[PDB]
Structure formats: structure tokens, C-alpha cells
DNA sequence: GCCAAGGGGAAAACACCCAAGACACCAGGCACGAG
DNA sequence: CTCGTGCCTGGTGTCTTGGGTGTTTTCCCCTTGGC
């Protein structure tokens, strides 16, 4: 089934009621999955531009953390 | 009350110690794959690398639903709307 | 090494927090125990009837003239429904709307049935909402003025267009009046302190209006209450009792000098009936459209007005033998939060934690406050909220959403201070169900050790003392014996200072 | 329908865009077309718009990609009581399928409508709209130029007044 | 430019006793400040700005200016 | 107190710069505690990077720093 | 007398607040799906 | 194996626009005045 939807709008609402956000308008869902979509591109881009120059072609929890420092997300609980 | 729906959820706020992943996993390792494969081929996800995205992204959405709350509430407004999303990213500079 | 600079904040609290707790379940029971005896608010309702018989109804020209009509003493309309007669109480009708449509005026009225009837919690307000019913009706009449005729066709239409939305407005004003009229106690008088030095402020702002646009007046103190009247002579009185509480605003960093009034009922304003009441006036420039006399100015003026409300404020207190102390916000102790819609500054007082810089105006009274919850506190977000539970759990729980993070130690402090009970919560499930479920069974409720369910269970309540807990996966990190080796080629070259 | 056909077996019997989401005026609307003007039933307010106002006709767009915006520049403007509007803004959806018969005959439709439409058909609203009141007001769709921005939407994020909106560059 | 310099330099000296005194300042720190000064004060009521087209108003509030920093993460 | 100094119209001119249209006097006050929040940290950072190069005054090359360091750098400028 | 300049009055264009209502969101319930 | 995701319904509640204020500005009426 299409991954897209696999952010189910469930997902979303969990996360939205979360971020303390009370009505959602349907809209937002469709946004949601763009931004998400946004978001994760370019952490994946970074991921693969880590995984480069490790020479490698199997995407590590390292690149994503190498990565999401990169952002200003930077991640605990992985590594050694 | 001593009945179900009543304990069990009452005190799984306190149960929730745990950092339960809201997206379903397969649902969006699929998605990373998806993704992953709109970038590249021949790329093994690690499913560590698929929970670090998980749970980045997860707490980062809840982080533009903060944003989204604010700025709904900005426009004295408790249902967000797209502009919000888009007033708090734009706000937030965090734009391609 | 032992660089921390004290005892966190919460272990010196978490005594009397905890104490807090046992007091507070102890006090629950046997007021919700006690309080289980009270009960309900019961209701009435009545029929639309137009006229009581076909006698009684109108023979009015228009109705003889095939011309819808409208019988304004009868709070009803009288059309020609296929050359019948037909009343239709006002009381009926949603509303009208007219469309010209080439050579035709449409004249279209809805009226409530089910499904029209939108918005209302009233879903089904008839009688017999299983019966059929008439949603609309809608006439046309040529533009044009037929031969013969004392009107165009269209002429009735546009008369009793205009006249029904006149009937109807004034309709539905008078039931209005009947909604917010209802429930008020007859405040017995005032007693205005006549030849005496009553104490006066006169640039005020009164919040709500009365009539449609603000007017200022001047505030007085008298024998048993306050009195603003306007510059347009309205007289608005205030017993002293019937003050909850009296709260000033000094003008510090606001635009405005504000006397807040917290009510223990709801007074009419005329237009709607308020429980806050507001007093105030301008600071400065609120328009500037894009200099120590104006800045000056300003320190002036407002010192003058802070003074003069200040000194407004002792007159009074000594007036009513300080039974109105004029809590002021311990500004200091102010944070970032929303109780209804917009962002603003909550500050508590000696009694109570509000803002009144905004409107609608905020206000808790602190006495009513059975716990506080601080849902969605989490390391990851960068804001929470807080819940009040009430004293009388019939009455709806308030969130004070987005309160910023930052706040969390300082105003667990304030409740501390307080002797404010509240607990944390990462998850914010339903207190409607909540309060119901408690509401029904309360002996239950506490017998599972009531509010204690909301305990992260932080240190060892014996009732629960292993929580929900089990071993993750994992041997407590132990670093095996092997794994120390390593450390020897900390080679000991003597790289330079 | 029990109802429906008794009134029906004593009765004496163009067509209905159903369920149509405008933005001007706001509200949902369903299009009965007849012969000269559209009679846009509300649900407590209705307007009939002759063709013969209809300035233009604009098919817009929307930056979301996923929604259109389509434009129906109006002279006279319709007296929204004492309101007015120059134009009739529709919003639909890409995907927000309907199905459409018309209350004529196919020699009728294809008298009036060259063959480049039939008496029943089905299809993207948007689409299909536009294609139906084209021919009802003859107007052209008015569409955006090679316009495409930075952020590929043909129109641009602003505001105008006490408001924002989408400028678009036609 | 548009602060008196005057004003911005006895105020920067001032805030930098609260540190530490002796502290004074080329010309080009105290500029370079101000350059600096300027553009932040610009981007956030350009923010602000959309604050308040978001809100439907064109009169800015400080909350306002405090929804921007909120959002910008500027505080702690 | 010579942030009080930071005069009403200096500040109204960014704003207008910042295309607002219209302000509220509260703006002033607001603005002017923005303005010695950024100034704080910039200064302390821009105090404790000239603290390194053992120097009393401050440089541009020190203050570049501060704001770089802070992502509100600077421009036009080289060596 | 013919022809022209000025102050003033009534109004228009704007940024903003208050009221109503309709749709569009969550809540409720029975069912299919794939973790 | 059965909890999670989803199609469908009603309601609300809550976001939209209409009605309205009064401020910043212009076009117009009124009247006196100069060649």
C-alpha cells in the first residue's frame, strides 16, 4: 500500500495532539506528508553524502547522526 | 472506577515511561525505503538509521505542531491550518 | 567534584508536595464523599403557536391581495401557499433571502427543521422531529408592475423581505434577553454616599460596553458598592460583595491602568450579562502610523495616573475597612501561557492567577483549584500546558496550553507557595471522561487510590512501589573484563605546555 | 423516494452541479444551469448569474498542487446583501471527481456544444466544470502564463490588505 | 543607520561594566555592532510583520514580536 | 540607561524599513528589551573572545566572531 | 463684471474590532487490513 | 491473531466573512477677492 498513506492520518493526528495542537484541519495531513517529506529528504541526502565517503552503498544510524547534528537536530542514543 | 478503559489508560500516562514511536514503524520504514529509493538504489537502511529518522522526525513534527499550535493560537485560532505550518516555517527559516 | 549548588528545587518541595498529596486525597474523599449528596438542574420548554384559532388569525389586505404578510402582533407571517392563507410563527423561520432572476423577484424563506436547525446542541428542537416538515418556502413576483395593481409583485416581496428580518431581529433579541436574563439574583441596591468625599477615578475605559461602542466614565466608591457612570450618563453599579475579587492592574509595561473585577455572578451590561468587569485608560500612542518631552510625558502620566489609581485604590480600602484589598499581579511571578486563544502573560495574585490586560478577561481563583496537571511536560518539547482541576468536578477542567517549558521549575514554585497540588503527565488524555468517570464513582476512584493515579511514581509509595516497571533489555551496562585492555598506549610523551 | 414518487404519481414534471465549494461568496452551492444564467442554490441564500456578465473566466492553479482555483469575473457583481463581488471564486480539488447530465436532448447537446461534450459524462470537477460553463457563457479559460516560480506554484505567496492570498502572474 | 550613535555607544559601554570595566571600544567593534544591531531588529519585525498578517492586523504588538523570537528560539 | 537612549524614531525607522505599517507605543519598550538581549550575548561572547586575545578593546575582528559564532554575521569585510 | 485662489465641510480608503454561520474536524461506530 | 486503520455518520465549533468604528486623506462647496 503506498507508503505515503502510511503516515496514516492517525500518525498525524498522535503527533499534532502531541504538539499540543487541538482541531486539525484535513489539509494540514496532506501538508504534513510534504514537510515530512521535506524534512526527511534532506536528512536522506545527507545520509548518502556520509555514506560516500565511507565508500559505502548500507545507510548507518551514523550518517543519520553525522546528519541530524548537521541540521540542528542533533540525536542521543545512538553510536558507541 | 475500578473498570477497564478506566485503569488501564489512566495509568498508562504513568505506565508510558516509555518513548513509544507514534508512526508505525513498517508503515514508515516503507516510506524511508520509498524515499531512500527516490533518492538511490542499493541502499540498506539499517533499522537503526530507520528509528533514528523515526523518532527525529517524530518528535521534529510534534516540534511544527508547537509551532502551528502558537501560530493557531497567534490568529486566535485553535484548528491549524496550512498557513500556519507555512507562517511557522517560514518564521522558522527552516525552508528549502 | 559535588559542584552542584543546592538541593534541586523539587526534592526541598517534594516533601511538602508530597504531603500535599496525602492531605489532598484525605481531603477529597471526604469532601467529594460529602458533596455526593447534592444533585441536578432541571428545564422547561413551550410551542410556537402563531394564532390559538382560524378566527383569531388576520384578514390583513395583503392576505386578500395573494401578499406575503407579516403580523408583527402575532410575531408571525401570513403567505399565500397555493391560495391559502397560511401563518407561519417568526419563531419558525431560519431566515430569508431574495434573488432577482431575469424578469422575476424570488423572495426565499427557510425555516428550522432538522438538518436547518445547524449549530444548535437543540438538533431536533421540534415537538415531533420525526414529522415532515416544510424546510422552505420561496415565492416569485415579476419586477415589473402588472396592470391594475395598487403594487409591483415584487413590492410585497421586498416588504416582507425587509419586514420579516425586522420581526425576526426583534424576535429573536427579546429571547435573547429571556437566555441571558435568567438566572440572576435581584441585587437589592447600592446606596450612593451622598455628601461625602467619595473616592473617584475618571479616565476609564468600561470593559465590556454597554451599548454597542466603548464610553468613558468615572468610578466611585460608596455606601455598599461601586458606581461608573459614563460620559453619556449610564449608571453602572457594583455591590462590594458581589466583588470575587478586585484586582489592579498598575499600568507597569502595559499600555493600560487597569481595575479588574472578578465576580462572584454575572451582572447585565444590558447587551450580555459578564462575571469580569474592567476599568482602565490608555497609556500612549496605541496607533502610531510609521523627544523627552513626549518619553517624559509619558514617565509623567503615567505616574500620575498610577499615583491617582493608587491613591483610588487606599481610598477605598479604607472606605471598606479594606474588605476589597486590591490584589496586585506579582508581575515577577508572570508567565507566558494561553487560558482561551491568544498568547498572553498569566500573573498570579494574592489569591488568584489571571490576566486581565486581555479580553475575554482571565481569572482562577486559587481556592477552587482541587490539583493541577502539567500535561505534555516532556525533555523533548519546548512548551506544556497545565490543567485545573476544580473543587466541584461538574464543572469543566481549564487548560493553559503552550505554556512555555522554561516556566516548568518556576511555576511548579509558585503552586509550591501556594500549597497547590499538581503532578505531570507526558500524555493529555480526556478529563471529560475523566470527571465523569469520577463523578459516577468516586468511592471507587478513591479507593484506587483516587488522584494518586496521575503519580509518575517517582519514589517508593509502598501501595505501588514497582509501578508498571519490568527490566528493559540490558544487564545494567557492566563493561566486561576485556574490554579495559586498551589503555596502555596512553603513551607518555611530555607534549608542551 | 417512497414520498418522491407518490408526489410524483400525481405530479406534473437544466441540470445540478451538486455540493460545489466556493470561496466567493463562502459557502457550498449547487449550480442548477438553466438556459441563460446560473441559479447557484445555497443553503439559506441563492443567485442567479445571467452569462451575459461574465467578464471572464479563470482556471487557476493552486500552489498545493492539488487544489484549483477557478474564477468567474462578475459585471454586475452580485449584491451579497449589502456586500458586493466582482467575481465568483470556486475551490476544487484535482482529485474531486462528479458526474454531470444535462436535462437536454443529445441532439440538443451536440447542437449547442460542437461534440466536445455529451449529454452525461463524469470526470475531475475542475475539468469538467470548466469545460461545461465555457460553452453555457462562452467565455475562454483563462489560464496562467509559462509562470512558474522558485517554488514551481504559478502564482505567488503575498498579501494584500488585512489578508493573504495568492497573486498570480497570468 | 538609523540609531544615535551617541546613545548605542554609551549603552554598549554601559552593559559591558555589568561584565567588566576598563572594557571600551573601537570604532569599527561599535559599527560593526550597530551593522550587526540593525539587520536583527529588521528581519525580526519583518517577521513580526507576517506575524500580523497572519494575525489580520497591520498595528504590531509586542506579542507579536514575541511569537517571532518564540518561534525563533531565541530564548533559552 | 542608555537604552532608553535608543530613540522612538530610530526604532520606528526599521520598522518602517521592516515594512510594518503601523506600531504600538509598547513596541518601544519591547524593542528596546530585545535590543539588549541580542546585545547581551553578542557582548559577552564578543567580551569573552577579545578576553582570549588578551585585549580591553574590542575589534571587529572580535565582534565578527560573536555574531559568526552566533550565526548573525556579518558582511563585506576580509584579511 | 469676469475670472480666479483660498479656507473649510463632507466625505472616502484604510487598519482594525465585534457577530453569525456553515463546513469540516473530531467523536462514534462497524468493518477490513496487515503488522 | 487481533489491534490498527478506515469508511460512514452526526454534530460542533470554530474560521470565515458581514457589519461597523474612526482615523488619514482627498474632492467639493462656499465665499471673497484682483485685473
Given at each position: 500500500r503506498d507508503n505515503i498513506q502510511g503516515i496514516t492520518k492517525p500518525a498525524i493526528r498522535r503527533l499534532a495532539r502531541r504538539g499540543g495542537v487541538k482541531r486539525i484541519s484535513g489539509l494540514i495531513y496532506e501538508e504534513t506528508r510534504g514537510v515530512l517529506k521535506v524534512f526527511l529528504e534532506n536528512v536522506i541526502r545527507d545520509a548518502v553524502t556520509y555514506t560516500e565517503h565511507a565508500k559505502r552503498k548500507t545507510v548507518t544510524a551514523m550518517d543519520v547522526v553525522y546528519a541530524l547534528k548537521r541540521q540542528g537536530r542533533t540525536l542521543y542514543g545512538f553510536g558507541g | 472506577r475500578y473498570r477497564p478503559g478506566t485503569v488501564a489508560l489512566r495509568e498508562i500516562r504513568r505506565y508510558q515511561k516509555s518513548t513509544e514511536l507514534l508512526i508505525r514503524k513498517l508503515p514508515f520504514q516503507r516510506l524511508v525505503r520509498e524515499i531512500a529509493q527516490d533518492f538511490k538504489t542499493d541502499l540498506r537502511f539499517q533499522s537503526s538509521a530507520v528509528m533514528a529518522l523515526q523518532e527525529a522526525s517524530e518528535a521534529y513534527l510534534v516540534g511544527l505542531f508547537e509551532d502551528t499550535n502558537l501560530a493557531a493560537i497567534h490568529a486566535k485560532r485553535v484548528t491549524i491550518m496550512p498557513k500556519d505550518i507555512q507562517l511557522a516555517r517560514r518564521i522558522r527559516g527552516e525552508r528549502a | 567534584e559535588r559542584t552542584r549548588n543546592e538541593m534541586t528545587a523539587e526534592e526541598k518541595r517534594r516533601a511538602h508536595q508530597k504531603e500535599l498529596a496525602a492531605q489532598l486525597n484525605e481531603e477529597a474523599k471526604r469532601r467529594l464523599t460529602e458533596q455526593k449528596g447534592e444533585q441536578q438542574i432541571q428545564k422547561a420548554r413551550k410551542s410556537n403557536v402563531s394564532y390559538k384559532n382560524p378566527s383569531l388569525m388576520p384578514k390583513e389586505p395583503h392576505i386578500r391581495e395573494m401578499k406575503i404578510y407579516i403580523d408583527k402582533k402575532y410575531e408571525t407571517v401570513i403567505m399565500p401557499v397555493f391560495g391559502i392563507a397560511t401563518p407561519f410563527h417568526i419563531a419558525t423561520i431560519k431566515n430569508i433571502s431574495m434573488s432577482v432572476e431575469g424578469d422575476y423577484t424570488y423572495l426565499r424563506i427557510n425555516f428550522y427543521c432538522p438538518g436547518s436547525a445547524?449549530?444548535?446542541?437543540?438538533?431536533?428542537?421540534?415537538?415531533?422531529?420525526?414529522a415532515t416538515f416544510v424546510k422552505e418556502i420561496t415565492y416569485r413576483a415579476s419586477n415589473i408592475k402588472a396592470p391594475g395593481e395598487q403594487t409591483v409583485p415584487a413590492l410585497n416581496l421586498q416588504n416582507a423581505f425587509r419586514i420579516i428580518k425586522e420581526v425576526q431581529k426583534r424576535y429573536k433579541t427579546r429571547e435573547a434577553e429571556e437566555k441571558e436574563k435568567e438566572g440572576i439574583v435581584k441585587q437589592d441596591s447600592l446606596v450612593i454616599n451622598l455628601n461625602r468625599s467619595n473616592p473617584k477615578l475618571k479616565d476609564l475605559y468600561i470593559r465590556p460596553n454597554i451599548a454597542q461602542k466603548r464610553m468613558q466614565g468615572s468610578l466611585e466608591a460608596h455606601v455598599n458598592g461601586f458606581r461608573f457612570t459614563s460620559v453619556r450618563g449610564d449608571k453602572v453599579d457594583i455591590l462590594y460583595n458581589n466583588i470575587k475579587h478586585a484586582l489592579f492592574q498598575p499600568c507597569d509595561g502595559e499600555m493600560i491602568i487597569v481595575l479588574h473585577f472578578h465576580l462572584k455572578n454575572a451582572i447585565m451590561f444590558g447587551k450580555k450579562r459578564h462575571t469580569d468587569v474592567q476599568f482602565y485608560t490608555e497609556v500612549g500612542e496605541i496607533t502610531t502610523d510609521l523627544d523627552l518631552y513626549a518619553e517624559q510625558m509619558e514617565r509623567e502620566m503615567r505616574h500620575k495616573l498610577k499615583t491617582a489609581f493608587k491613591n483610588f485604590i487606599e481610598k477605598v480600602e479604607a472606605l471598606t475597612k479594606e474588605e476589597l484589598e486590591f490584589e496586585v499581579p506579582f508581575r515577577d511571578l508572570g508567565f507566558n501561557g494561553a487560558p482561551y486563544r491568544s498568547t498572553c502573560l498569566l500573573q498570579p495574585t494574592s489569591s488568584a492567577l489571571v490576566?486581565?490586560?486581555?479580553?475575554?478577561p482571565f481569572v482562577v481563583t486559587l481556592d477552587e483549584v482541587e490539583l493541577i496537571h502539567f500535561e505534555r511536560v516532556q525533555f523533548h518539547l519546548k512548551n506544556f500546558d497545565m490543567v485545573i482541576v476544580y473543587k466541584d468536578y461538574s464543572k469543566k477542567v481549564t487548560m493553559i496550553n503552550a505554556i512555555p517549558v522554561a516556566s516548568l521549575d518556576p511555576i511548579k514554585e509558585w503552586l509550591n507557595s501556594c500549597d497547590l497540588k499538581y503532578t505531570e503527565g507526558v500524555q493529555s488524555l480526556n478529563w471529560t471522561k475523566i470527571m465523569k468517570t469520577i463523578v459516577d464513582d468516586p468511592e471507587g476512584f478513591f479507593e484506587q487510590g483516587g488522584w494518586s493515579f496521575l503519580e509518575p511514581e517517582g519514589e517508593g509509595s509502598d501501595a505501588e512501589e514497582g509501578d508498571s516497571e519490568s527490566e528493559i533489555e540490558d544487564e545494567t551496562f557492566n563493561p566486561s573484563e576485556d574490554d579495559y585492555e586498551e589503555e596502555e598506549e596512553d603513551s607518555d610523551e611530555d607534549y608542551s605546555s | 423516494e417512497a414520498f418522491a414518487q407518490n408526489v410524483l404519481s400525481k405530479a406534473d414534471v437544466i441540470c445540478i452541479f451538486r455540493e460545489l465549494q466556493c470561496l466567493t461568496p463562502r459557502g457550498r452551492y449547487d449550480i442548477r444551469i438553466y438556459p441563460t444564467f446560473?441559479?447557484?442554490?445555497?443553503?439559506?441564500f441563492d443567485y442567479k448569474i445571467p452569462?451575459?456578465?461574465?467578464?471572464r473566466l479563470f482556471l487557476l492553479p493552486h500552489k498545493d498542487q492539488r487544489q484549483m482555483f477557478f474564477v468567474i469575473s462578475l459585471?454586475?457583481?452580485?449584491?451579497?446583501?449589502?456586500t458586493r463581488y466582482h467575481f465568483l471564486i470556486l475551490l476544487f480539488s484535482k482529485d474531486e471527481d462528479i458526474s454531470l447530465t444535462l436535462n437536454m436532448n443529445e441532439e440538443e447537446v451536440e447542437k449547442r456544444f460542437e461534440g466536445r461534450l455529451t449529454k452525461n459524462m463524469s470526470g475531475s470537477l475542475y475539468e469538467m466544470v470548466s469545460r461545461v460553463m465555457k460553452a453555457l457563457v462562452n467565455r475562454k479559460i483563462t489560464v496562467p502564463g509559462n509562470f512558474q516560480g522558485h517554488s514551481g506554484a504559478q502564482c505567488i505567496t503575498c498579501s494584500y490588505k488585512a489578508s493573504s492570498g495568492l497573486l498570480y502572474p497570468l
Open positions: - | - | 445547524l449549530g444548535r446542541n437543540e438538533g431536533n428542537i421540534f415537538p415531533n422531529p420525526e490576566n486581565a490586560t486581555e479580553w475575554p | 446560473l441559479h447557484l442554490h445555497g443553503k439559506t452569462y451575459t456578465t461574465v467578464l459585471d454586475p457583481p452580485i449584491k451579497q446583501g449589502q
